[PDB]
Amino acid sequence: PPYTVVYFPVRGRCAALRMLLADQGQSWKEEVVTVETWQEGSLKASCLYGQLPKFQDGDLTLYQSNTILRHLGRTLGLYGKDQQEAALVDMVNDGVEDLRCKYISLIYTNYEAGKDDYVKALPGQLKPFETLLSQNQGGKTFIVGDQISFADYNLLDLLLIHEVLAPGCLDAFPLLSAYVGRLSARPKLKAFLASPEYVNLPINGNGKQ
Amino acid sequence: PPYTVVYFPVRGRCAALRMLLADQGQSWKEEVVTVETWQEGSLKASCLYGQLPKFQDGDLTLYQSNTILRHLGRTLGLYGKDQQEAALVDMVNDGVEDLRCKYISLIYTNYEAGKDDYVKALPGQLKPFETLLSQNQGGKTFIVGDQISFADYNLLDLLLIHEVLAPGCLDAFPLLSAYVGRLSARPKLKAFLASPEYVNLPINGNGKQ
Ligand SMILES: O=C(O)CCCc1ccc(N(CCCl)CCCl)cc1
Ligand SMILES: [Cl-]
């Protein structure tokens, strides 16, 4: 395949780009990195910012999950119909990234002490996405415009992982709820989400979710 | 088109997009938001993620500093010559954002206890940008390709505030040192960087730097 994903055996920051590739019917290869290979040090030292994912599209080598999402969005026509929609797509993705960083901090950094406070604050963090939906054709299509964008896949992932963290958190958000059901039912996406290559990976690297 | 930036009287997350506008010969309006006005609550409630900057470009309203940078980059032709360069631009900008996040956490959250460890870890955080410069026409031009991008303005800001935090932090990095000097000397940028509207604003909102 022309695309290669180099990552740990986890969903994590590669979940959204994999859904994207799967739902767009694109071929890719997974190169899996074990704790042992990572602790050896040489791969890590070769990575631009000492981190995975690493991504290859022929001889173009990329780092940073949002860089990969933008690159696939650009090349696969999932980045708005014009320059205005492209900006709105970015605004969504930035908000998605912001909550993801808070999620990651909780998971890896203080799950036991921090979880109750995090869940109390969750609805205030989810509301901007409901608002965005309410303002785009009554929330019945995508997060921006009338075609799917890389931000939809990233937002969808963020909502799925939060329903695992806080079951029922979308009960307060009818548009986000319907949106999850709707995108998850796209046939290629539905098949990928049900498959062992997705189901048999943990969400995170430390066994918390 | 016309442009408006709504923000606190600080450089912070608006410094890079202001440098972009100035260097590109663009005109803009500053709407300054005081501590008192922000604490009142109504502006904040009206902001998509309850954060500034808020940006207006004619009828288009944007939030999130990197969304504003990409929008200005897209519409003004500061986003690489092709898809490969656009992707590398994003990769640089995401890396700048990551280190910016750490800087902000230090400044607002942990300045006294945390600064020594932060400064000790700094060279390893700067090395990737030196490397990227080394791989692009010997570091003689821009961070990506041979035309300026929005990532150059963001990286330049990151470098300037870090020289304030850790004087001499670029001395081991010849390409970065020369890049800062060279970009800073661009006539419109030089003029803006010397102006009271930049010089007389603090870097951050809490008086630390
Ligand atoms: O944008 C960034 O860099 C992140 C920090 C943004 C920020 C800047 C200033 C203030 N205040 C000063 C108002 Cl004059 C409130 C006191 Cl801290 C609050 C937040
Ligand atoms: Cl992750």
Residue with tokens 């997705």: A198
**What CATH number is given to the structural domain containing B137?**
1.20.1050.10
Q: Examine the domain organization and report whether A66 and A51 are in the same domain.
A: yes
Give the integer Cα–Cα distance in Å for B8 and B13. Answer: 10
B44 CB contacts (<8 Å, ≥6 apart)? B38, B50
The answer to whether B88 touches B80, Cβ cutoff 8 Å, is yes
Break sites following residues in chain B (C–N > 2.5 A): none
Q: Examine the domain organization and report whether A107 and A165 are in the same domain.
A: yes
The answer to whether A52 touches A8, Cβ cutoff 8 Å, is yes
Q: Examine the domain organization and report whether A192 and A171 are in the same domain.
A: no
Structural domains of chain A, count: 2
Q: Give backbone dihedrals phi and psi of B67, rounded to 5 degrees, phi first.
A: -60, -45
Q: Is A51 exposed, middle or buried (0-12, 13-18, 19+ CB in 10 A)?
A: middle
**What CATH number is given to the structural domain containing B41?**
3.40.30.10
Distance from CA of B64 to the nearest CA of A (A): 6
Method: X-ray
Q: Examine the domain organization and report whether B179 and B103 are in the same domain.
A: yes
Nearest residue to A35 via CA among A161, A206, A208: A206
The answer to whether B78 touches B24, Cβ cutoff 8 Å, is yes
Helices vs strands, H then E, count in chain A: 10, 4
Which residue range(s) make up the domain with A124?
Answer: 79-186
Give the integer Cα–Cα distance in Å for A90 and B6. Answer: 19
Cβ–Cβ of B91/A60 closer than 8 Å?
no
Cβ–Cβ of B70/A87 closer than 8 Å?
yes
CA within 13 Å, CB half, B117: 8
The answer to whether A198 touches A20, Cβ cutoff 8 Å, is no
Give the integer Cα–Cα distance in Å for B120 and B102. Answer: 13
CA within 13 Å, CB half, B4: 12
Of B84, B95, B128, the CB nearest to A60: B84
A19 CB contacts (<8 Å, ≥6 apart)? A153, A156, A157, A189, A192, A193
| Nearest-CA residue for atom 12 of ligand 1 | B205
User: Which helix (H) or strand (E) covers residue B159, if one does?
Assistant: helix B150-165
Question: Judging by DSSP bridges, how do beta strands B3-7 and B28-32 pair with one another?
Answer: parallel
Q: Resolution of the experimental model in angstroms, please? A: 1.9
The answer to whether B79 touches A79, Cβ cutoff 8 Å, is no
CB of B71 within 8 Å of any CB in chain A?
yes
Give the integer Cα–Cα distance in Å for A70 and B86. Answer: 9
- What's at A46, amino acid-wise? S
Q: Examine the domain organization and report whether A57 and A95 are in the same domain.
A: no
Give the integer Cα–Cα distance in Å for A55 and B165. Answer: 34
Regarding the beta carbon of B209 and ligand 1, being less than 6 Å apart is answered no
Q: Examine the domain organization and report whether B37 and B87 are in the same domain.
A: no
In DSSP terms, A3 is beta-bridged to: A28, A57
Q: Examine the domain organization and report whether B160 and B199 are in the same domain.
A: no
Q: Examine the domain organization and report whether A94 and A17 are in the same domain.
A: no
Q: Which two tokens stand for residue A83?
A: 């320059």
Give the integer Cα–Cα distance in Å for A56 and A3. Answer: 5
Q: Examine the domain organization and report whether B193 and B145 are in the same domain.
A: no
Give the integer Cα–Cα distance in Å for A11 and A205. Answer: 9
The answer to whether B12 touches B204, Cβ cutoff 8 Å, is yes
- What's at B93, amino acid-wise? N
Q: Which two tokens stand for residue A57?
A: 């599209």
Task: Give the 3-state secondary structure of residue A84.
Answer: helix
DSSP B172: T
Distance from CA of A128 to the nearest CA of B (A): 6
DSSP B15: H
